[PDB]
């Protein structure tokens, strides 16, 4: 779909194991958010 990135840019959802494109940062299958993407609150 995009020639400037590879599958190695994909992230694996840990809730359902879907391989997801770099963006968005929620899983396209189950909507679970990607971890350690957003700044951690104190």
């Amino acid at each position: 779909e995009d020639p400037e990135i590879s599958l190695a840019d994909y992230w694996k959802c840990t809730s359902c194991n879907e391989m997801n494109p770099p963006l968005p940062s929620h899983c396209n299958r189950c909507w679970a958010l990607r971890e350690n993407w957003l700044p951690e609150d104190k």
Partner: protein
């Protein structure tokens, strides 16, 4: 001194078509000076009200001086601090911010608040692969950035 930004991708998720989506387009236009492209749902997702093929998000690609500038705004919001998780095995990296107003866009109670996703694809100014570690020390040196340990 020999590693460059190839592009910066930006994305705002809404989840459905309508007012809030079209306002997320504007925010990207104001922020970016380009017209964003609406993304469609890959799958319907019942429990989140998502329907396959519906317009649900907006994204924009920026290059050159514009990309550097927007990245810097994003990094400043993040206080120049990412995690090793943010860095792909390809030598690219991305991150999110909770509120778009922190890039310096005025808050409108009509508009609301948007989260924003950044993805940065690196390259060489010329095909030799960029490792995860090169991109990491590039970020560390060029932005005096901090990469927290992997969680």
């Amino acid at each position: 001194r020999e590693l460059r930004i190839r592009k910066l991708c930006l994305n705002i998720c809404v989840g459905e078509s309508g007012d809030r989506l079209t306002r997320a387009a504007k925010v990207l236009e104001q922020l970016t000076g380009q017209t964003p492209v609406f993304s469609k749902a890959r799958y319907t997702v019942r429990s989140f009200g998502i329907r396959r093929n519906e317009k649900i998000a907006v994204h924009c690609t920026v290059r050159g001086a514009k990309a550097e500038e927007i990245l810097e705004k994003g990094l400043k919001v993040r206080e120049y601090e990412l995690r090793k998780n943010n860095f792909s095995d390809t030598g690219n990296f991305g991150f999110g911010i909770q509120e778009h107003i922190d890039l310096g866009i005025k808050y409108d109670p009509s508009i609301g608040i948007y989260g924003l996703d950044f993805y940065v694809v690196l390259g060489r100014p010329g095909k030799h692969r960029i490792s995860k570690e090169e991109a990491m020390r590039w970020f560390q040196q060029k932005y005096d950035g901090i990469i927290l340990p992997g969680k």
